[PDB]
Structure 1
Amino acid sequence: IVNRKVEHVEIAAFENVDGLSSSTFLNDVILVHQGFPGISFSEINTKTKFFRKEISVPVMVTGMTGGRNELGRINKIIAEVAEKFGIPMGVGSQRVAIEKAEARESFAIVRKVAPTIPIIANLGMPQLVKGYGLKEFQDAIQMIEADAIAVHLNPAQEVFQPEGEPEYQIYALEKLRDISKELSVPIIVKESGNGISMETAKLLYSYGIKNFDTSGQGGTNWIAIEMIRDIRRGNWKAESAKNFLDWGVPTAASIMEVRYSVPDSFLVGSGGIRSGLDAAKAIALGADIAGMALPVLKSAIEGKESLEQFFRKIIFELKAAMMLTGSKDVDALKKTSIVILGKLKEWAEYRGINLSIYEKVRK
């Protein structure tokens, strides 16, 4: 509590950037109550598959950090709790540990304290245009004995950074498609707060990507975070960032767009998942699991007991929503009755998402 944290963690944890001027559109999704659930709360089974492993609840912690000692302390807390609950955990970008051996332990610690759960490696898509490839993926994976690797897209954050220029030439996907052949674990492509559209999902699927993490708008606003970095430097790009605070595909729309355009994908619904009711909605809408990042960071900073109480609350809320929809298991929740209203309805109509066909696909 004396030394400063890296600036992006300092801002995410302590500034007003969660859902700032943005929306998941989850308020436009209603799960229909069943006054006769047909199940017992104690029979509800929240187990599900995550590649070759079984996990205890259809939630994951998505990648955030690593690379300095204090960041390894936060990673260790999150991993210990994730191991206890049987939930998968992604790490943050491993680029610093690829570059510097001293940064490695703040990632490897995760696997030491969480030997059984799925652990998910992380590198950013622009690194593929800047020299990273098969070897650096394998290094990231072996560092934490990962069961998958996430490749993140963050062009909106990069456009509004004080220095910088997003680079997403098609060569990156050509290289990723090559790497996907040689890796021993699956690739998931995720956004970083601005969501995945049907066009992007279909382009990724054409290069062999089958696993996606929506990371839609409505949760951590990385455009807001770069706006605050720009404010702190007296950088005029801050006022430009302000005009883009509601840029991106809202999480509920991105889950519908990826499930509809890639019906057989393995889909993580994330970006603004803050309760187990949000998690249930994301699954019923079409995700296979719900992901969360910021609220886990905030609770882990408060400490291990805070984070265990956080997962207790999320799991309770998910099971309440399953009980009150008569969903005895995760498969039943994916098929349960919903109502779609409001702006989400209008988004799907304009985008050509024929709801009857949608309903069949999501199940």
Structure 2
Amino acid sequence: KHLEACLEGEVAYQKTTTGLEGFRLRYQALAGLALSEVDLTTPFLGKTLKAPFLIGAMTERINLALAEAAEALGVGMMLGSGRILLERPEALRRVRKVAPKALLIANLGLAQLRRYGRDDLLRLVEMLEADALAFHVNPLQEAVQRGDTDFRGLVERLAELLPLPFPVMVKEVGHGLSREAALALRDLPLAAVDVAGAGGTSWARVEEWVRFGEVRHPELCEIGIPTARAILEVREVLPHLPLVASGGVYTGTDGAKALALGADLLAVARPLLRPALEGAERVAAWIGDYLEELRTALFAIGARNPKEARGRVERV
């Protein structure tokens, strides 16, 4: 569906980048620490993850694979647009069968707050038996896919539905959250921001690859906040909220770089998707590769753990 674009099309950004190639890892030959004691263990949205990683949201055989990998690996998982479920409740025909203990994030999209209402959300979130809810905010994509294009007053509605019984994050989808995105999110009691930055998959470009099987407006589709900038920007404003770096953060090294710009967890999506198509055990491989690298990067930089990486980079 979109599935065909992510899999088949040149949907990756063609000119913007995460910006992380702009930073270089401060390498610490004499840090006198031991691979050994670089500890990926990171708590998130109230479950203790085994490394600071979320399989990032994608859109029913695919999820099952990720879901098992998530379990096997003590990573976390966001869970496509539950958009359908909010008036098709037995399209829950759903992932906790293969993933009891894993951290599930249900994900929704701020816009849906305009049809649905608190209950609908408590009901979604338990429908999926998730641990938290991601609202995805996504104007460009939406604009581009000639889709529901009204983000007007979304934040107030979020604002007032607030401190919901489960954790809530706002994320973007890869055209990224700005400084001012964040000033808006500023005291909504959210549990997490996913900055979902520019650099990897462009939803814009995706959307158009569906409309025209090619990208008519290469350039619009590059609109966005390159992940590194977004981390930097968002953190500067929310010192305390846990930041998810996602958006073209496709290698664990890049991951560390991300961590070092002050982020907290990493998330991947499009790259995870093909593996997703040959089952967990494979996905599982991909992810644990990323963390094996990550660990190593963190070790190279003298960080004993993902939080200890803030600062450990300089402008290439």
Corresponding residue to 2:270 among 291, 294, 304: 294
**1:244 aligned counterpart, secondary structure:** helix
Q: CA deviation at 1:55?
A: 0.8
Percent identity reads 36
Give the equivalent residue in structure 2 for 1:159: 143
Task: Give the conservation status (yes or no) of the 8 Å contact 1:201–1:261.
Answer: yes
Task: Give the conservation status (yes or no) of the 8 Å contact 2:256–2:306.
Answer: no
- Normalised TM-score (structure 1): 0.83
C-alpha distance in 2 between matches for 1:122 and 1:247: 23
Q: CA deviation at 1:262?
A: 1.3
Partner letter of residue 155 of structure 2? L
Q: CA deviation at 1:304?
A: 2.5
Structure 1 runs of 4+ aligned residues shifted over 4 Å read none
Give the equivalent residue in structure 2 for 1:224: 205
Partner letter of residue 67 of structure 2? A
Give the equivalent residue in structure 2 for 1:120: 105
Does residue 176 (structure 1) correspond to residue 147 (structure 2)? The answer is: no
Does residue 25 (structure 1) correspond to residue 19 (structure 2)? The answer is: yes
**Which structure carries more helix by proportion?**
1
Q: Spell out the pairing of 1:308-319 with structure 2 (5 A cutoff).
A: 308-319=284-295
Partner letter of residue 128 of structure 1? L
Give the equivalent residue in structure 2 for 1:346: none
Q: Spell out the pairing of 1:22-171 with structure 2 (5 A cutoff).
A: 22-65=16-59, 72-105=60-93, 108=94, 110-129=95-114, 131-161=115-145, 163-170=146-153
Corresponding residue to 2:218 among 242, 254, 268: 242
Q: Which has the higher contact order (CA 8 A, sep 6+)?
A: 2
Structure 1, gaps ≥5 residues long: 1-6, 66-71, 342-363
Q: CA deviation at 1:18?
A: 2.1
Tell me how large the CA RMSD over aligned residues is: 1.6
Partner letter of residue 140 of structure 1? L
Task: Give the conservation status (yes or no) of the 8 Å contact 1:22–1:245.
Answer: no
Partner letter of residue 179 of structure 1? L
C-alpha distance in 1 between matches for 2:302 and 2:243: 23
Deviations, residues 298-341 of structure 1 (Å, cap 9, x unaligned): 2111332321220121011101101111211223223x421024
C-alpha distance in 2 between matches for 1:216 and 1:331: 20
Task: Give the conservation status (yes or no) of the 8 Å contact 1:93–1:124.
Answer: yes
Partner letter of residue 247 of structure 2? G
Give the equivalent residue in structure 2 for 1:307: 283
Give the equivalent residue in structure 2 for 1:358: none
Deviations, residues 177-234 of structure 1 (Å, cap 9, x unaligned): 22223x21111000011110111101111444352101111111111112212214x9
Structure 2, gaps ≥5 residues long: none
Which is greater in Rg? Answer: 1
Task: Give the conservation status (yes or no) of the 8 Å contact 1:119–1:146.
Answer: yes
C-alpha distance in 1 between matches for 2:280 and 2:99: 14
Partner letter of residue 16 of structure 1? E
Q: CA deviation at 1:291?
A: 0.7
Task: Give the conservation status (yes or no) of the 8 Å contact 1:98–1:140.
Answer: yes
Task: Give the conservation status (yes or no) of the 8 Å contact 1:90–1:121.
Answer: yes
Task: Give the conservation status (yes or no) of the 8 Å contact 2:40–2:52.
Answer: yes
C-alpha distance in 2 between matches for 1:210 and 1:55: 15
Does residue 195 (structure 1) correspond to residue 176 (structure 2)? The answer is: yes
Corresponding residue to 2:244 among 237, 252, 268: 268
| 1:322–1:21 distance in 2 versus 1, CA, 3 Å | same
Task: Give the conservation status (yes or no) of the 8 Å contact 1:268–1:289.
Answer: yes
Task: Give the conservation status (yes or no) of the 8 Å contact 1:23–1:246.
Answer: no
Deviations, residues 87-134 of structure 1 (Å, cap 9, x unaligned): 0111011011122133112xx2x21211112111111111122x2110
- Normalised TM-score (structure 2): 0.95
C-alpha distance in 2 between matches for 1:304 and 1:58: 19
Partner letter of residue 339 of structure 1? E
Give the equivalent residue in structure 2 for 1:331: 307
Give the equivalent residue in structure 2 for 1:356: none
Task: Give the conservation status (yes or no) of the 8 Å contact 2:162–2:188.
Answer: no
Residue correspondences, number:
316
**2:161 aligned counterpart, secondary structure:** helix
Task: Give the conservation status (yes or no) of the 8 Å contact 2:259–2:307.
Answer: no
Task: Give the conservation status (yes or no) of the 8 Å contact 1:214–1:254.
Answer: yes
